[PDB]
PDB file of C-alpha atoms and ligand atoms in Angstrom:
ATOM      1  CA  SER A  90      21.135  61.432 -63.158  1.00  0.00           C
ATOM      2  CA  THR A  91      17.429  61.732 -63.847  1.00  0.00           C
ATOM      3  CA  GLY A  92      15.178  63.742 -66.127  1.00  0.00           C
ATOM      4  CA  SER A  93      11.505  64.653 -65.939  1.00  0.00           C
ATOM      5  CA  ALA A  94       9.531  66.354 -68.701  1.00  0.00           C
ATOM      6  CA  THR A  95       5.878  67.136 -69.158  1.00  0.00           C
ATOM      7  CA  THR A  96       4.175  65.716 -72.242  1.00  0.00           C
ATOM      8  CA  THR A  97       1.139  67.576 -73.639  1.00  0.00           C
ATOM      9  CA  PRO A  98      -1.565  66.347 -76.066  1.00  0.00           C
ATOM     10  CA  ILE A  99      -1.308  68.106 -79.418  1.00  0.00           C
ATOM     11  CA  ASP A 100      -5.110  68.457 -79.752  1.00  0.00           C
ATOM     12  CA  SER A 101      -8.458  67.785 -78.055  1.00  0.00           C
ATOM     13  CA  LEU A 102      -8.416  64.100 -79.106  1.00  0.00           C
ATOM     14  CA  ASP A 103      -4.950  63.174 -77.691  1.00  0.00           C
ATOM     15  CA  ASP A 104      -3.870  62.314 -81.225  1.00  0.00           C
ATOM     16  CA  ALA A 105      -0.260  62.529 -80.030  1.00  0.00           C
ATOM     17  CA  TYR A 106       1.776  64.062 -77.270  1.00  0.00           C
ATOM     18  CA  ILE A 107       4.642  66.523 -77.494  1.00  0.00           C
ATOM     19  CA  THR A 108       7.489  66.941 -75.067  1.00  0.00           C
ATOM     20  CA  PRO A 109       9.947  69.843 -75.159  1.00  0.00           C
ATOM     21  CA  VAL A 110      13.528  68.860 -75.936  1.00  0.00           C
ATOM     22  CA  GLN A 111      16.573  71.138 -75.805  1.00  0.00           C
ATOM     23  CA  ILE A 112      18.991  70.618 -78.708  1.00  0.00           C
ATOM     24  CA  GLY A 113      22.277  72.417 -79.203  1.00  0.00           C
ATOM     25  CA  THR A 114      24.155  75.296 -77.596  1.00  0.00           C
ATOM     26  CA  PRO A 115      22.560  77.701 -76.963  1.00  0.00           C
ATOM     27  CA  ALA A 116      19.509  75.486 -76.532  1.00  0.00           C
ATOM     28  CA  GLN A 117      17.004  75.219 -79.319  1.00  0.00           C
ATOM     29  CA  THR A 118      13.755  73.886 -77.858  1.00  0.00           C
ATOM     30  CA  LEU A 119      11.720  71.670 -80.131  1.00  0.00           C
ATOM     31  CA  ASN A 120       8.533  69.835 -79.279  1.00  0.00           C
ATOM     32  CA  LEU A 121       9.055  66.186 -80.126  1.00  0.00           C
ATOM     33  CA  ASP A 122       6.767  63.185 -80.235  1.00  0.00           C
ATOM     34  CA  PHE A 123       8.359  60.598 -77.935  1.00  0.00           C
ATOM     35  CA  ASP A 124       7.828  57.290 -79.724  1.00  0.00           C
ATOM     36  CA  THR A 125       8.497  53.961 -77.984  1.00  0.00           C
ATOM     37  CA  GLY A 126       7.792  52.302 -81.338  1.00  0.00           C
ATOM     38  CA  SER A 127      10.764  53.764 -83.225  1.00  0.00           C
ATOM     39  CA  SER A 128      14.420  54.512 -82.656  1.00  0.00           C
ATOM     40  CA  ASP A 129      15.270  57.723 -84.562  1.00  0.00           C
ATOM     41  CA  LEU A 130      15.521  61.178 -83.032  1.00  0.00           C
ATOM     42  CA  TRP A 131      14.745  63.341 -86.047  1.00  0.00           C
ATOM     43  CA  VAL A 132      13.770  66.984 -86.343  1.00  0.00           C
ATOM     44  CA  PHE A 133      12.494  69.562 -88.700  1.00  0.00           C
ATOM     45  CA  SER A 134      15.510  71.628 -89.531  1.00  0.00           C
ATOM     46  CA  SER A 135      17.062  74.450 -91.540  1.00  0.00           C
ATOM     47  CA  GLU A 136      17.713  71.676 -94.122  1.00  0.00           C
ATOM     48  CA  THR A 137      14.057  70.675 -94.490  1.00  0.00           C
ATOM     49  CA  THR A 138      12.609  71.437 -97.970  1.00  0.00           C
ATOM     50  CA  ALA A 139      10.960  74.833 -97.380  1.00  0.00           C
ATOM     51  CA  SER A 140       7.596  73.794 -98.927  1.00  0.00           C
ATOM     52  CA  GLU A 141       7.437  70.873 -96.419  1.00  0.00           C
ATOM     53  CA  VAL A 142       7.671  73.155 -93.359  1.00  0.00           C
ATOM     54  CA  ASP A 143       4.373  74.747 -92.209  1.00  0.00           C
ATOM     55  CA  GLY A 144       4.627  76.173 -88.704  1.00  0.00           C
ATOM     56  CA  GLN A 145       7.098  73.723 -87.090  1.00  0.00           C
ATOM     57  CA  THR A 146      10.015  74.964 -85.030  1.00  0.00           C
ATOM     58  CA  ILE A 147      13.233  73.976 -86.785  1.00  0.00           C
ATOM     59  CA  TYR A 148      16.648  72.946 -85.527  1.00  0.00           C
ATOM     60  CA  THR A 149      19.401  74.996 -87.158  1.00  0.00           C
ATOM     61  CA  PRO A 150      22.703  73.176 -86.594  1.00  0.00           C
ATOM     62  CA  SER A 151      24.751  76.125 -87.887  1.00  0.00           C
ATOM     63  CA  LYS A 152      23.535  78.103 -84.806  1.00  0.00           C
ATOM     64  CA  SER A 153      24.723  75.432 -82.326  1.00  0.00           C
ATOM     65  CA  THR A 154      28.305  75.601 -81.186  1.00  0.00           C
ATOM     66  CA  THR A 155      28.153  71.903 -80.195  1.00  0.00           C
ATOM     67  CA  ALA A 156      26.655  70.592 -83.471  1.00  0.00           C
ATOM     68  CA  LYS A 157      28.914  68.495 -85.695  1.00  0.00           C
ATOM     69  CA  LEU A 158      27.978  66.887 -88.998  1.00  0.00           C
ATOM     70  CA  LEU A 159      28.156  63.085 -88.700  1.00  0.00           C
ATOM     71  CA  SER A 160      29.943  62.833 -92.012  1.00  0.00           C
ATOM     72  CA  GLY A 161      28.402  60.503 -94.544  1.00  0.00           C
ATOM     73  CA  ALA A 162      25.494  59.470 -92.345  1.00  0.00           C
ATOM     74  CA  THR A 163      21.966  59.460 -93.725  1.00  0.00           C
ATOM     75  CA  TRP A 164      18.656  58.228 -92.484  1.00  0.00           C
ATOM     76  CA  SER A 165      15.265  57.335 -93.911  1.00  0.00           C
ATOM     77  CA  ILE A 166      12.266  56.043 -92.051  1.00  0.00           C
ATOM     78  CA  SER A 167       8.755  54.907 -92.886  1.00  0.00           C
ATOM     79  CA  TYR A 168       6.143  54.572 -90.139  1.00  0.00           C
ATOM     80  CA  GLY A 169       3.148  52.221 -89.717  1.00  0.00           C
ATOM     81  CA  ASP A 170       0.756  55.063 -90.776  1.00  0.00           C
ATOM     82  CA  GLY A 171       2.490  55.493 -94.199  1.00  0.00           C
ATOM     83  CA  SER A 172       4.385  58.690 -93.195  1.00  0.00           C
ATOM     84  CA  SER A 173       8.100  59.059 -93.809  1.00  0.00           C
ATOM     85  CA  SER A 174      11.067  61.344 -93.454  1.00  0.00           C
ATOM     86  CA  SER A 175      14.753  61.320 -94.332  1.00  0.00           C
ATOM     87  CA  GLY A 176      17.888  63.411 -94.195  1.00  0.00           C
ATOM     88  CA  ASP A 177      21.378  63.707 -92.786  1.00  0.00           C
ATOM     89  CA  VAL A 178      22.756  63.576 -89.274  1.00  0.00           C
ATOM     90  CA  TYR A 179      24.449  65.831 -86.733  1.00  0.00           C
ATOM     91  CA  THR A 180      25.644  65.018 -83.279  1.00  0.00           C
ATOM     92  CA  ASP A 181      24.747  67.567 -80.626  1.00  0.00           C
ATOM     93  CA  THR A 182      23.860  67.965 -76.981  1.00  0.00           C
ATOM     94  CA  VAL A 183      20.257  66.948 -76.252  1.00  0.00           C
ATOM     95  CA  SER A 184      18.504  67.495 -72.942  1.00  0.00           C
ATOM     96  CA  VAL A 185      15.101  66.224 -71.824  1.00  0.00           C
ATOM     97  CA  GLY A 186      13.701  67.395 -68.532  1.00  0.00           C
ATOM     98  CA  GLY A 187      17.146  68.262 -67.153  1.00  0.00           C
ATOM     99  CA  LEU A 188      18.845  65.055 -68.342  1.00  0.00           C
ATOM    100  CA  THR A 189      21.630  65.805 -70.836  1.00  0.00           C
ATOM    101  CA  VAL A 190      23.264  63.550 -73.425  1.00  0.00           C
ATOM    102  CA  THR A 191      26.269  64.777 -75.305  1.00  0.00           C
ATOM    103  CA  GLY A 192      27.037  63.412 -78.739  1.00  0.00           C
ATOM    104  CA  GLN A 193      23.396  62.426 -79.477  1.00  0.00           C
ATOM    105  CA  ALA A 194      22.617  61.714 -83.088  1.00  0.00           C
ATOM    106  CA  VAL A 195      20.112  64.364 -84.195  1.00  0.00           C
ATOM    107  CA  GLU A 196      18.724  63.330 -87.562  1.00  0.00           C
ATOM    108  CA  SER A 197      18.014  66.475 -89.581  1.00  0.00           C
ATOM    109  CA  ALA A 198      15.139  66.108 -92.028  1.00  0.00           C
ATOM    110  CA  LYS A 199      15.693  67.084 -95.617  1.00  0.00           C
ATOM    111  CA  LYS A 200      12.308  65.618 -96.597  1.00  0.00           C
ATOM    112  CA  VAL A 201       9.136  64.887 -94.653  1.00  0.00           C
ATOM    113  CA  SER A 202       5.861  63.379 -95.878  1.00  0.00           C
ATOM    114  CA  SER A 203       2.647  65.399 -96.028  1.00  0.00           C
ATOM    115  CA  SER A 204       1.286  64.139 -92.655  1.00  0.00           C
ATOM    116  CA  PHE A 205       4.342  65.702 -90.893  1.00  0.00           C
ATOM    117  CA  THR A 206       4.099  68.991 -92.810  1.00  0.00           C
ATOM    118  CA  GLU A 207       0.369  69.230 -92.006  1.00  0.00           C
ATOM    119  CA  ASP A 208       0.974  68.788 -88.248  1.00  0.00           C
ATOM    120  CA  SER A 209       2.415  72.166 -87.161  1.00  0.00           C
ATOM    121  CA  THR A 210       2.575  71.032 -83.488  1.00  0.00           C
ATOM    122  CA  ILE A 211       5.157  68.204 -83.927  1.00  0.00           C
ATOM    123  CA  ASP A 212       8.726  69.339 -84.599  1.00  0.00           C
ATOM    124  CA  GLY A 213      10.082  65.801 -84.868  1.00  0.00           C
ATOM    125  CA  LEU A 214      10.230  62.442 -83.127  1.00  0.00           C
ATOM    126  CA  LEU A 215      12.367  61.079 -80.318  1.00  0.00           C
ATOM    127  CA  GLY A 216      12.498  57.332 -80.651  1.00  0.00           C
ATOM    128  CA  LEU A 217      12.565  55.160 -77.491  1.00  0.00           C
ATOM    129  CA  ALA A 218      12.435  51.664 -78.985  1.00  0.00           C
ATOM    130  CA  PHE A 219      15.612  49.592 -79.123  1.00  0.00           C
ATOM    131  CA  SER A 220      18.566  51.039 -81.020  1.00  0.00           C
ATOM    132  CA  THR A 221      18.608  48.023 -83.367  1.00  0.00           C
ATOM    133  CA  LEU A 222      15.765  49.834 -85.254  1.00  0.00           C
ATOM    134  CA  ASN A 223      17.678  53.057 -85.773  1.00  0.00           C
ATOM    135  CA  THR A 224      17.818  53.847 -89.494  1.00  0.00           C
ATOM    136  CA  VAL A 225      21.110  55.764 -89.663  1.00  0.00           C
ATOM    137  CA  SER A 226      23.458  54.414 -92.315  1.00  0.00           C
ATOM    138  CA  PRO A 227      26.190  53.372 -92.572  1.00  0.00           C
ATOM    139  CA  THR A 228      26.732  53.562 -88.804  1.00  0.00           C
ATOM    140  CA  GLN A 229      23.587  52.869 -86.779  1.00  0.00           C
ATOM    141  CA  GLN A 230      23.052  55.336 -83.936  1.00  0.00           C
ATOM    142  CA  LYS A 231      21.827  55.001 -80.369  1.00  0.00           C
ATOM    143  CA  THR A 232      18.600  56.332 -78.953  1.00  0.00           C
ATOM    144  CA  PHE A 233      18.602  59.113 -76.394  1.00  0.00           C
ATOM    145  CA  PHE A 234      17.681  56.520 -73.721  1.00  0.00           C
ATOM    146  CA  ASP A 235      20.432  54.137 -74.750  1.00  0.00           C
ATOM    147  CA  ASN A 236      22.999  57.006 -74.600  1.00  0.00           C
ATOM    148  CA  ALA A 237      21.655  58.209 -71.228  1.00  0.00           C
ATOM    149  CA  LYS A 238      21.255  54.768 -69.665  1.00  0.00           C
ATOM    150  CA  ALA A 239      24.634  54.303 -68.009  1.00  0.00           C
ATOM    151  CA  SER A 240      24.345  57.807 -66.365  1.00  0.00           C
ATOM    152  CA  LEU A 241      20.829  57.245 -65.022  1.00  0.00           C
ATOM    153  CA  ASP A 242      20.143  56.400 -61.392  1.00  0.00           C
ATOM    154  CA  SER A 243      18.147  53.358 -62.687  1.00  0.00           C
ATOM    155  CA  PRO A 244      18.112  52.216 -66.350  1.00  0.00           C
ATOM    156  CA  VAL A 245      14.426  52.997 -66.849  1.00  0.00           C
ATOM    157  CA  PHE A 246      12.038  55.533 -68.260  1.00  0.00           C
ATOM    158  CA  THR A 247       8.385  55.875 -67.549  1.00  0.00           C
ATOM    159  CA  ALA A 248       5.423  57.071 -69.546  1.00  0.00           C
ATOM    160  CA  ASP A 249       2.525  58.614 -67.721  1.00  0.00           C
ATOM    161  CA  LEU A 250       0.274  59.924 -70.490  1.00  0.00           C
ATOM    162  CA  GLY A 251      -2.777  61.994 -69.633  1.00  0.00           C
ATOM    163  CA  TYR A 252      -6.338  61.656 -70.896  1.00  0.00           C
ATOM    164  CA  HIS A 253      -7.119  65.066 -72.346  1.00  0.00           C
ATOM    165  CA  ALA A 254      -4.427  66.449 -70.009  1.00  0.00           C
ATOM    166  CA  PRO A 255      -0.648  66.691 -69.741  1.00  0.00           C
ATOM    167  CA  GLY A 256       1.417  63.815 -68.401  1.00  0.00           C
ATOM    168  CA  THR A 257       5.045  63.040 -67.732  1.00  0.00           C
ATOM    169  CA  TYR A 258       8.046  61.213 -69.131  1.00  0.00           C
ATOM    170  CA  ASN A 259      10.615  60.414 -66.453  1.00  0.00           C
ATOM    171  CA  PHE A 260      14.099  59.062 -67.024  1.00  0.00           C
ATOM    172  CA  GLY A 261      16.122  57.226 -64.449  1.00  0.00           C
ATOM    173  CA  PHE A 262      13.589  56.863 -61.638  1.00  0.00           C
ATOM    174  CA  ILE A 263      10.150  55.574 -60.711  1.00  0.00           C
ATOM    175  CA  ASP A 264       7.878  58.174 -59.235  1.00  0.00           C
ATOM    176  CA  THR A 265       6.104  56.078 -56.579  1.00  0.00           C
ATOM    177  CA  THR A 266       3.533  58.941 -56.177  1.00  0.00           C
ATOM    178  CA  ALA A 267       2.410  58.711 -59.813  1.00  0.00           C
ATOM    179  CA  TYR A 268       0.492  55.394 -59.610  1.00  0.00           C
ATOM    180  CA  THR A 269      -1.824  53.413 -57.351  1.00  0.00           C
ATOM    181  CA  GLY A 270      -1.254  49.908 -56.080  1.00  0.00           C
ATOM    182  CA  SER A 271       1.756  48.020 -57.373  1.00  0.00           C
ATOM    183  CA  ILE A 272       3.585  47.850 -60.696  1.00  0.00           C
ATOM    184  CA  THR A 273       3.233  44.484 -62.447  1.00  0.00           C
ATOM    185  CA  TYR A 274       6.232  43.653 -64.590  1.00  0.00           C
ATOM    186  CA  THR A 275       6.040  41.468 -67.665  1.00  0.00           C
ATOM    187  CA  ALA A 276       8.593  40.024 -70.033  1.00  0.00           C
ATOM    188  CA  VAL A 277       9.778  41.828 -73.161  1.00  0.00           C
ATOM    189  CA  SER A 278      11.056  40.389 -76.417  1.00  0.00           C
ATOM    190  CA  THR A 279      13.481  42.704 -78.197  1.00  0.00           C
ATOM    191  CA  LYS A 280      13.660  40.414 -81.260  1.00  0.00           C
ATOM    192  CA  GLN A 281      11.744  42.911 -83.459  1.00  0.00           C
ATOM    193  CA  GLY A 282      13.347  45.996 -81.759  1.00  0.00           C
ATOM    194  CA  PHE A 283      10.120  46.906 -79.956  1.00  0.00           C
ATOM    195  CA  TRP A 284       8.920  46.855 -76.380  1.00  0.00           C
ATOM    196  CA  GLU A 285       7.022  43.672 -77.278  1.00  0.00           C
ATOM    197  CA  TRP A 286       5.151  41.880 -74.558  1.00  0.00           C
ATOM    198  CA  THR A 287       2.203  39.484 -74.111  1.00  0.00           C
ATOM    199  CA  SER A 288      -1.011  40.586 -72.529  1.00  0.00           C
ATOM    200  CA  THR A 289      -2.842  37.877 -70.628  1.00  0.00           C
ATOM    201  CA  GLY A 290      -6.314  38.755 -71.966  1.00  0.00           C
ATOM    202  CA  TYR A 291      -9.147  41.188 -71.995  1.00  0.00           C
ATOM    203  CA  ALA A 292     -12.606  42.072 -70.879  1.00  0.00           C
ATOM    204  CA  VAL A 293     -15.264  44.291 -72.430  1.00  0.00           C
ATOM    205  CA  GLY A 294     -17.110  46.501 -69.999  1.00  0.00           C
ATOM    206  CA  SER A 295     -18.336  44.569 -66.979  1.00  0.00           C
ATOM    207  CA  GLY A 296     -17.971  41.281 -68.912  1.00  0.00           C
ATOM    208  CA  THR A 297     -15.942  38.272 -67.831  1.00  0.00           C
ATOM    209  CA  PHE A 298     -12.223  38.356 -68.459  1.00  0.00           C
ATOM    210  CA  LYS A 299     -11.088  36.207 -71.370  1.00  0.00           C
ATOM    211  CA  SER A 300      -7.674  34.644 -70.684  1.00  0.00           C
ATOM    212  CA  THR A 301      -5.802  34.710 -73.993  1.00  0.00           C
ATOM    213  CA  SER A 302      -2.237  35.618 -74.963  1.00  0.00           C
ATOM    214  CA  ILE A 303      -2.034  38.809 -77.048  1.00  0.00           C
ATOM    215  CA  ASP A 304       1.458  39.639 -78.222  1.00  0.00           C
ATOM    216  CA  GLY A 305       1.909  43.325 -78.977  1.00  0.00           C
ATOM    217  CA  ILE A 306       4.066  46.398 -78.570  1.00  0.00           C
ATOM    218  CA  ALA A 307       3.932  49.287 -76.146  1.00  0.00           C
ATOM    219  CA  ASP A 308       3.977  52.217 -78.604  1.00  0.00           C
ATOM    220  CA  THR A 309       3.569  55.776 -77.378  1.00  0.00           C
ATOM    221  CA  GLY A 310       3.790  57.024 -80.946  1.00  0.00           C
ATOM    222  CA  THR A 311       0.605  55.230 -82.026  1.00  0.00           C
ATOM    223  CA  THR A 312      -2.655  56.920 -81.062  1.00  0.00           C
ATOM    224  CA  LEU A 313      -5.010  53.949 -80.924  1.00  0.00           C
ATOM    225  CA  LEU A 314      -5.216  50.405 -79.557  1.00  0.00           C
ATOM    226  CA  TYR A 315      -4.848  47.839 -82.351  1.00  0.00           C
ATOM    227  CA  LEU A 316      -5.844  44.291 -81.394  1.00  0.00           C
ATOM    228  CA  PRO A 317      -6.850  41.108 -83.153  1.00  0.00           C
ATOM    229  CA  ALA A 318     -10.088  41.244 -85.089  1.00  0.00           C
ATOM    230  CA  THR A 319     -11.795  38.754 -82.734  1.00  0.00           C
ATOM    231  CA  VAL A 320     -11.122  41.000 -79.717  1.00  0.00           C
ATOM    232  CA  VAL A 321     -12.110  44.160 -81.555  1.00  0.00           C
ATOM    233  CA  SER A 322     -15.363  42.659 -82.867  1.00  0.00           C
ATOM    234  CA  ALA A 323     -16.214  41.515 -79.315  1.00  0.00           C
ATOM    235  CA  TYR A 324     -15.694  45.072 -78.074  1.00  0.00           C
ATOM    236  CA  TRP A 325     -17.734  46.875 -80.736  1.00  0.00           C
ATOM    237  CA  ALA A 326     -20.553  44.311 -80.591  1.00  0.00           C
ATOM    238  CA  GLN A 327     -21.343  45.888 -77.186  1.00  0.00           C
ATOM    239  CA  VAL A 328     -21.998  49.319 -78.811  1.00  0.00           C
ATOM    240  CA  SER A 329     -25.372  49.701 -80.545  1.00  0.00           C
ATOM    241  CA  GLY A 330     -24.902  50.798 -84.101  1.00  0.00           C
ATOM    242  CA  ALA A 331     -21.104  50.293 -84.212  1.00  0.00           C
ATOM    243  CA  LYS A 332     -19.753  48.908 -87.439  1.00  0.00           C
ATOM    244  CA  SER A 333     -16.545  48.495 -89.384  1.00  0.00           C
ATOM    245  CA  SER A 334     -16.546  51.008 -92.255  1.00  0.00           C
ATOM    246  CA  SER A 335     -14.187  50.243 -95.186  1.00  0.00           C
ATOM    247  CA  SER A 336     -14.861  53.817 -96.437  1.00  0.00           C
ATOM    248  CA  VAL A 337     -13.751  55.422 -93.147  1.00  0.00           C
ATOM    249  CA  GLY A 338     -10.991  52.854 -92.436  1.00  0.00           C
ATOM    250  CA  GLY A 339     -12.161  51.219 -89.227  1.00  0.00           C
ATOM    251  CA  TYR A 340     -14.849  50.862 -86.620  1.00  0.00           C
ATOM    252  CA  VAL A 341     -17.198  53.788 -86.198  1.00  0.00           C
ATOM    253  CA  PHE A 342     -19.986  54.218 -83.743  1.00  0.00           C
ATOM    254  CA  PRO A 343     -22.881  56.626 -83.131  1.00  0.00           C
ATOM    255  CA  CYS A 344     -21.648  59.725 -81.400  1.00  0.00           C
ATOM    256  CA  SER A 345     -24.702  59.365 -79.124  1.00  0.00           C
ATOM    257  CA  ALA A 346     -23.274  56.121 -77.663  1.00  0.00           C
ATOM    258  CA  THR A 347     -21.813  55.624 -74.208  1.00  0.00           C
ATOM    259  CA  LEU A 348     -18.808  53.321 -74.743  1.00  0.00           C
ATOM    260  CA  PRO A 349     -17.921  50.426 -72.457  1.00  0.00           C
ATOM    261  CA  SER A 350     -14.540  50.178 -70.845  1.00  0.00           C
ATOM    262  CA  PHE A 351     -11.902  47.790 -72.093  1.00  0.00           C
ATOM    263  CA  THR A 352      -9.666  45.848 -69.746  1.00  0.00           C
ATOM    264  CA  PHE A 353      -6.339  44.274 -70.674  1.00  0.00           C
ATOM    265  CA  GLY A 354      -4.300  41.857 -68.631  1.00  0.00           C
ATOM    266  CA  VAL A 355      -0.724  42.328 -67.467  1.00  0.00           C
ATOM    267  CA  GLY A 356       0.128  39.048 -65.792  1.00  0.00           C
ATOM    268  CA  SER A 357      -2.514  38.620 -63.054  1.00  0.00           C
ATOM    269  CA  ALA A 358      -3.107  42.380 -63.026  1.00  0.00           C
ATOM    270  CA  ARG A 359      -5.685  44.340 -64.984  1.00  0.00           C
ATOM    271  CA  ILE A 360      -5.591  47.781 -66.625  1.00  0.00           C
ATOM    272  CA  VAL A 361      -8.984  49.325 -67.282  1.00  0.00           C
ATOM    273  CA  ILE A 362      -9.363  51.754 -70.197  1.00  0.00           C
ATOM    274  CA  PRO A 363     -12.461  53.840 -69.499  1.00  0.00           C
ATOM    275  CA  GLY A 364     -14.977  54.027 -72.321  1.00  0.00           C
ATOM    276  CA  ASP A 365     -14.420  57.716 -72.808  1.00  0.00           C
ATOM    277  CA  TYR A 366     -10.755  57.040 -73.771  1.00  0.00           C
ATOM    278  CA  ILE A 367     -12.042  55.025 -76.795  1.00  0.00           C
ATOM    279  CA  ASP A 368     -13.998  57.965 -78.297  1.00  0.00           C
ATOM    280  CA  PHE A 369     -12.029  59.738 -81.078  1.00  0.00           C
ATOM    281  CA  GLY A 370     -14.911  61.983 -82.045  1.00  0.00           C
ATOM    282  CA  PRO A 371     -16.667  62.715 -85.313  1.00  0.00           C
ATOM    283  CA  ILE A 372     -15.148  61.174 -88.449  1.00  0.00           C
ATOM    284  CA  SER A 373     -15.503  64.595 -90.117  1.00  0.00           C
ATOM    285  CA  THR A 374     -16.479  67.853 -88.635  1.00  0.00           C
ATOM    286  CA  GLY A 375     -20.176  67.825 -87.675  1.00  0.00           C
ATOM    287  CA  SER A 376     -20.711  64.128 -88.345  1.00  0.00           C
ATOM    288  CA  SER A 377     -22.736  61.988 -85.955  1.00  0.00           C
ATOM    289  CA  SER A 378     -20.460  59.017 -86.794  1.00  0.00           C
ATOM    290  CA  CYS A 379     -17.554  58.805 -84.349  1.00  0.00           C
ATOM    291  CA  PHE A 380     -14.250  57.013 -84.812  1.00  0.00           C
ATOM    292  CA  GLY A 381     -13.339  54.240 -82.441  1.00  0.00           C
ATOM    293  CA  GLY A 382     -10.188  54.069 -80.385  1.00  0.00           C
ATOM    294  CA  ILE A 383      -9.924  50.301 -80.565  1.00  0.00           C
ATOM    295  CA  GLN A 384      -9.251  49.035 -84.103  1.00  0.00           C
ATOM    296  CA  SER A 385      -8.229  45.779 -85.746  1.00  0.00           C
ATOM    297  CA  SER A 386      -4.556  45.024 -86.186  1.00  0.00           C
ATOM    298  CA  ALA A 387      -5.355  42.619 -89.046  1.00  0.00           C
ATOM    299  CA  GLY A 388      -3.084  43.589 -91.960  1.00  0.00           C
ATOM    300  CA  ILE A 389      -0.709  45.609 -89.714  1.00  0.00           C
ATOM    301  CA  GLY A 390       1.035  42.345 -88.723  1.00  0.00           C
ATOM    302  CA  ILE A 391       1.394  43.335 -85.035  1.00  0.00           C
ATOM    303  CA  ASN A 392      -0.860  44.316 -82.157  1.00  0.00           C
ATOM    304  CA  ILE A 393      -0.180  47.798 -80.853  1.00  0.00           C
ATOM    305  CA  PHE A 394      -0.847  49.037 -77.343  1.00  0.00           C
ATOM    306  CA  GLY A 395      -0.887  52.686 -78.364  1.00  0.00           C
ATOM    307  CA  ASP A 396      -1.793  55.732 -76.392  1.00  0.00           C
ATOM    308  CA  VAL A 397      -5.435  54.681 -75.804  1.00  0.00           C
ATOM    309  CA  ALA A 398      -4.106  51.784 -73.716  1.00  0.00           C
ATOM    310  CA  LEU A 399      -0.937  53.349 -72.310  1.00  0.00           C
ATOM    311  CA  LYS A 400      -2.612  56.496 -71.004  1.00  0.00           C
ATOM    312  CA  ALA A 401      -4.762  54.310 -68.731  1.00  0.00           C
ATOM    313  CA  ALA A 402      -1.557  53.186 -66.951  1.00  0.00           C
ATOM    314  CA  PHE A 403       1.747  54.249 -65.461  1.00  0.00           C
ATOM    315  CA  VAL A 404       4.161  52.385 -67.736  1.00  0.00           C
ATOM    316  CA  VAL A 405       7.737  51.477 -66.860  1.00  0.00           C
ATOM    317  CA  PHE A 406      10.137  50.813 -69.722  1.00  0.00           C
ATOM    318  CA  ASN A 407      12.863  48.897 -67.871  1.00  0.00           C
ATOM    319  CA  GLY A 408      16.070  48.927 -69.935  1.00  0.00           C
ATOM    320  CA  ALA A 409      18.062  46.645 -67.644  1.00  0.00           C
ATOM    321  CA  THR A 410      20.209  43.933 -69.226  1.00  0.00           C
ATOM    322  CA  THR A 411      16.987  41.852 -69.489  1.00  0.00           C
ATOM    323  CA  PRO A 412      14.374  44.494 -70.402  1.00  0.00           C
ATOM    324  CA  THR A 413      10.885  44.295 -68.932  1.00  0.00           C
ATOM    325  CA  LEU A 414       7.698  46.407 -69.009  1.00  0.00           C
ATOM    326  CA  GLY A 415       5.809  47.449 -65.911  1.00  0.00           C
ATOM    327  CA  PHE A 416       2.196  48.578 -65.713  1.00  0.00           C
ATOM    328  CA  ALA A 417       0.355  50.155 -62.782  1.00  0.00           C
ATOM    329  CA  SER A 418      -3.083  51.661 -62.487  1.00  0.00           C
ATOM    330  CA  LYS A 419      -3.192  55.357 -61.663  1.00  0.00           C
TER     331      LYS A 419
HETATM  332 NA1   NA B 501      -7.851  59.389 -88.195  1.00  0.00          NA
END
């Protein structure tokens, strides 16, 4: 089997991407944030505290003939950005892009933090990291990909995120039309439950490539590119008037600037992030200070290849017995 679903930016900045997911019988379609940095499929629901719902589409298990309470199971998750959610668990049929999993754990939110409530466009998350990070207790649950894997034509999914445009998540096949050149594969450590890999270095604009190992995760649920402070300072030093603002919480730059590209290494290959991808617009409406898309990972404890980096590539998440990541230009 295979599945193919379009993923759409939630706003004009590509702050996140939503992908429609069918849950239950008859189908309830919710727009989920597919997150390769977490392992819970959780949704706004009929159980969510009413004051914490503001515009989201909710999953109502009582209206699904295939829903069953997973008795005793609870979940609670906290993300890198400080947001959180928790609740109880149902199993139900979940389909993405025509690919169906029966018996998927659907984590129903009883509580969500303010950032979720305030984002009316995201109805929940579908985690695509390794199932060892799943928060369900007392019986850890499998991700949608892990449940689908054995049925797929190939044990892979791919992320093809758009810049200010829709993209695609495919399951079970490589679309050889979706990228240019060849896919370069690189080793993955699953020791922290992430798609953790080591970039071979970077370049700023037309500058020389610096060969240096940068360990980090491929995380579709993180908007920005978080890299070591040395790399980040080297990037922003090429932008006149850029500075790190403690008040704003990262590097800002004059909105009048033209940003340089940023290149990262994948083995001997190179992925180029155009400068425009690094512009996250005014820090507040009408400001001439713009927020940068490349930020320091110092104090986060891991480097994160978030959407700013991943949307410059066709990314293969190879879930074979020995997982690997693939990157191609597109
Ligand atoms: Na922000």
